[PDB]
């Protein structure tokens, strides 16, 4: 979240990040494996 590439992944001025954007950012940094990103999406707060 503190990293700046993930800031280039956040798009809307809401200050949040989309589900697909967050998933592909997680995969692009490879700080998390596939199932780890899936579990992060499970624990994440989905929006409209």
């Amino acid at each position: 979240v503190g990293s700046e590439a993930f800031q280039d992944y956040v798009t809307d001025p809401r200050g949040l990040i989309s589900k697909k954007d967050f998933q592909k950012a997680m995969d692009s940094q490879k700080q998390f494996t596939g199932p780890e990103i899936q579990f992060l999406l499970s624990c994440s707060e989905a929006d409209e």
């Binding site: 590439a5 940094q29 490879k30 700080q31």
Partner: protein, 48 residues
């Protein structure tokens, strides 16, 4: 601040014996930190 000039120059490792320091820096930086960003910083092209 002065070394920032030869970050992108193609003759960066000219006097130094090792010629693939740019590729090594891409290998250990850019997977996490942005490969395109590190390539731009080092002044070298992925297709090249």
């Amino acid at each position: 601040q002065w070394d920032r000039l030869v970050l992108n120059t193609p003759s960066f490792p000219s006097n130094y014996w090792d010629k693939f320091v740019k590729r090594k820096v891409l290998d250990k930086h850019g997977d996490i930190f942005g490969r395109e960003r590190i390539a731009e910083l080092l002044g070298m092209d992925l297709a090249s």
